[model samples]
Target: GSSGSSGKVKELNLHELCAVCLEDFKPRDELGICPCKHAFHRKCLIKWLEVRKVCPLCNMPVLQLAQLSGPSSG
Candidate 1:
């Protein structure tokens, strides 16, 4: 079932894939950013957060940043 319109979601900007899923980015991909500046898709990173508290690249502690926002928001 090679549907032509099924997987045509790509272009120059989307050519850069994320490290988590190896999936390309789109103009409106809702990119998620870690304190380490490693970008990932939001869905990918939320799931990653469940298992890891550090960046996939530099291994920076992402969980620590969450506490800063928690106290500020509350």
Candidate 2:
């Protein structure tokens, strides 16, 4: 399954390069934005998550998951 944050870059801003791969993105490139808003190539972050679940920068949560109790259940 693909990892990294759910959101993507709508348009190029500071997306000069990816934090994970350390390579600049080309037009039509798939970029990933972490919860902390760190930018990285989607494919890059996918592999990064294999080792850690935090942003490569700021050490913040990136698409962290949680469990929920069933409604009307104890």
Candidate 3:
């Protein structure tokens, strides 16, 4: 039954989709919310952080530009 939503809660296996950029985890990169636990693709997150370190959704400062970009990817 299509509820007008492309993705269903049952289909979502990983963490919740980022509230900032409305999209799922893509291979090239992913984004993570600052101390808030929100996650996103790297490419999207970095660009987002550059604009503002605060979590896009929660407004929490959880990003370490240097560290997060390097390790979290792995």
Candidate 4:
């Protein structure tokens, strides 16, 4: 989950794939989340952000590109 202008990212279960690249997240894979609650691989997301700074799924503004902090919860 993520919130605020800093856009803190929390790791989640790898049940969902990245909306951008359409790939499953691996264990220890870097992840990023937009404020709208969309998830994407950090690599894919950064590249996307370079072109557009909005959630690809929701079309909401992505306030920041904060890296997932700490460890995966589940």
Name the best candidate (by lDDT). Answer: 4
Each prediction's whole-model lDDT (CA): 0.71, 0.68, 0.62, 0.73
Tens digit of per-residue lDDT, candidate 3, span 1-74 = 23565654564477656555666566566444455556676766777778886767777776445454455553
Please list all clashing residue pairs in model 3, or write none if there are none: 29-42, 30-40, 30-41, 30-42, 31-40, 31-41, 31-42, 33-38, 35-62
Per-model TM values vs. the true structure: 0.62, 0.56, 0.48, 0.57
Candidate 1 is scored at a TM of 0.62
Error of 1 at 57 (Å): 1.6
Candidate 1 segments exceeding 4 Å error? 1-10, 13-15, 66-74
Across 37-68, the per-residue lDDT of candidate 1 in tens digits comes to 68888888888778886676687776555535
**Model 3, stretches more than 4 Å misplaced?**
1-15, 26-34, 63-74
Off by over 4 Å in 4: 1-15, 63-74
Off by over 4 Å in 2: 1-15, 63-74
Report RMSD (Å) for each prediction in the order shown.
5.1, 11.2, 7.1, 15.7
CA displacement after TM-score superposition, residue 34 of candidate 3 (Å): 4.2
The Cα error of candidate 1 at residue 53, in Å, is: 1.7
- Return the TM-score for candidate 3, rounded to 2 decimals: 0.48
**In candidate 1, which residue pairs clash?**
none
Q: Record all residue pairs in model 2 with backbone atoms less than 3 Å apart, i.e. clashing.
A: none
What is the lDDT for 21 in model 2?
66
Against the hidden true structure, what lDDT does model 4 obtain? 0.73
